[PDB]
DNA sequence: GGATTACACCCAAGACACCAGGCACGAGACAGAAAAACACAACGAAAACGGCCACCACCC
């Protein structure tokens, strides 16, 4: 970041294609690359089913997971979540309101509030819930399959 | 007119003496920096923002 190149043969080359330009800082502040690192600068450079996955988008951001299915566009994967819901208590939400989760229970939500469909896969409001857990189409940005360091909750549950 | 004879001296060999180029070291005043400059108390007053992108949204 901040950093831009443009591979000319001459200093006043570069001068020039970097002039008339304000998103640049006025120094001509260039440095030379080795021959070894004129490829390290162009560089391109873990998602597997099953895999222990935590979320970061809308309301069920901070969750942790597992993926599901992926789709063939290869933008969208499925995934395992334990449902924050709230039963109908006071449907008449964000990130910080949110209640604590709890795996689906099909007997509450009976009760207080739910199409059945097969034995543990209950779509409820546009949700997939199987075997109690929730199920949903979740955006590949919107998960984290990398670097996700369990914590005391996820041992006690996962 | 060259050698030869008779002879004056004097100057180079030999002993012990000297100059200035640069080189190590003082310090030099410049400047340039910092860096601190009363006690106690009372009152009122205003106090971060851009773009981000799911999500609700509207007409299509």
Same mark, same amino acid.
């Given at each position: 970041?901040?950093?831009?190149?443009?591979?000319?043969?001459?200093?006043?080359?570069?001068?020039?294609?970097?002039?008339?330009?304000?998103?640049? &800082?006025?120094?001509? @502040?260039? &440095?030379?690359?080795?021959?070894?690192?004129?490829?390290?600068?162009?560089?391109?450079?873990?998602?597997?089913?099953? #895999?222990?996955?935590?979320?970061?988008?809308?309301?069920?951001?901070?969750?942790?997971?597992?993926?599901?299915?992926?789709?063939?566009?290869?933008?969208?994967?499925?995934?395992?979540?334990?449902? *924050?819901?709230?039963?109908?208590?006071?449907? @008449?939400?964000? #990130?910080?309101?949110?209640?604590?989760?709890?795996?689906?229970?099909?007997?509450?939500? *009976?009760?207080?509030?739910?199409?059945?469909?097969?034995?543990?896969?209950?779509?409820?409001?546009?949700?997939?819930?199987?075997?109690?857990?929730?199920?949903?189409?979740? *955006?590949?940005?919107?998960?984290?399959?990398?670097?996700?360091?369990?914590?005391?909750?996820?041992? #006690?549950?996962?």
């Amino acid at each position: 970041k901040g950093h831009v190149y443009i591979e000319a043969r001459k200093a006043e080359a570069i001068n020039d294609a970097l002039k008339g330009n304000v998103n640049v &800082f006025s120094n001509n @502040s260039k &440095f030379l690359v080795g021959i070894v690192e004129y490829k390290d600068l162009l560089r391109p450079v873990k998602l597997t089913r099953g #895999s222990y996955v935590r979320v970061k988008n809308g309301k069920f951001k901070g969750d942790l997971a597992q993926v599901d299915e992926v789709l063939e566009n290869g933008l969208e994967a499925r995934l395992k979540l334990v449902p *924050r819901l709230d039963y109908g208590k006071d449907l @008449s939400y964000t #990130s910080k309101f949110r209640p604590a989760q709890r795996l689906f229970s099909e007997a509450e939500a *009976r009760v207080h509030e739910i199409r059945r469909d097969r034995d543990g896969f209950v779509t409820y409001g546009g949700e997939e819930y199987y075997e109690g857990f929730l199920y949903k189409t979740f *955006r590949l940005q919107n998960l984290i399959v990398n670097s996700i360091n369990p914590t005391l909750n996820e041992l #006690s549950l996962f």
